[PDB]
């Protein structure tokens, strides 16, 4: 569906062109491998990385900036919890989240309009299903 | 060119095969001192797969042997820095392994191209 596809399209370009382009951000492009960091999942409850966000976008998980940002926010919060607040990992994670937020403000009004249209479409489907 | 097709083939080994080794991502780009501060103290002749791709894009490699020297240096470097028994060195060894296998699946083509890159050098010298 048209508006949801357009909305996912934009989120995906934010991930690929901006978030993944943060210098030295490579370790956040991949899930942490529990064989090599055996305590990571003792500490981190809800893992996330940039390749998983891309997979979620391709399946239209996100109908709104808010559910996209809940997964982006985990990138920072997990790094703080596992790698520590003054770790170079965490400095890189903050940059990843900062570019995402700054990019999304450039597209504010258009993403507001696409969210409204996704919701109007959805509503039309439900009342229409009766 | 023999060189354009040769470089194409090497780049596809790096991206398709060597970068596909599981958990090989730490070898895909140069180490940053900000993450590994003693790394360039220990490793005086650094190498990574992105660097090999830039080398290929500049046609630095005229033969498999010059290409393999850089590939092998990735393993020689992991040996010194991470240690001979390190998990990272087992991956580096696997990257080295899949490079050698893929070169074989392309032997005849690469030989043709490698011969023709010389023919050009001698045409140059004969004309010089």
């Amino acid at each position: 569906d048209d508006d949801q596809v357009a909305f996912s399209f934009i989120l995906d370009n934010i991930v690929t062109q901006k978030m993944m382009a943060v210098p030295d951000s490579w370790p956040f492009h991949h899930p942490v491998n529990k064989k090599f960091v055996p305590d990571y999942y003792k500490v981190i409850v809800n893992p996330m990385d940039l390749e998983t966000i891309r997979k979620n976008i391709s399946k239209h998980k996100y109908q709104s900036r808010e559910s996209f940002l809940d997964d982006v926010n985990l990138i920072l919060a997990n790094s703080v919890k596992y790698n520590g607040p003054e770790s170079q990992y965490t400095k890189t994670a903050q940059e990843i989240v900062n570019v995402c937020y700054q990019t999304l403000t450039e597209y504010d009004e258009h993403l507001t309009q696409l969210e409204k249209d996704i919701c109007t479409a959805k509503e039309a489907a439900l009342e229409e299903a009766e | 060119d023999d060189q354009v097709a040769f470089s194409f083939i090497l780049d596809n080994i790096v991206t398709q095969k060597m970068m596909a080794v599981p958990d090989s991502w730490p070898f895909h780009h140069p180490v940053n001192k900000k993450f590994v501060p003693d790394y360039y103290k220990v490793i005086v002749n650094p190498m990574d797969l992105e660097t090999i791709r830039k080398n290929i894009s500049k046609h630095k490699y005229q033969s498999r042997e010059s290409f393999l020297d850089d590939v092998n240096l990735i393993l020689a470097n992991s040996v010194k820095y991470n240690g001979p028994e390190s998990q990272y060195t087992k991956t580096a060894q696997e990257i080295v392994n899949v490079c050698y296998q893929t070169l074989t699946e392309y032997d005849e083509h690469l030989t043709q191209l490698e011969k023709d890159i010389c023919t050009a050098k001698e045409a140059a010298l004969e004309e010089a």
Binding site: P27, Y82, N83 | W25, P26, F35, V36, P37, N82, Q87
Partner: peptide, 11 residues
């Protein structure tokens, strides 16, 4: 913090 992922990301 946990035990740490080391400088290179895989321990």
């Amino acid at each position: 913090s946990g035990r740490g992922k080391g400088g290179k990301g895989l321990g």
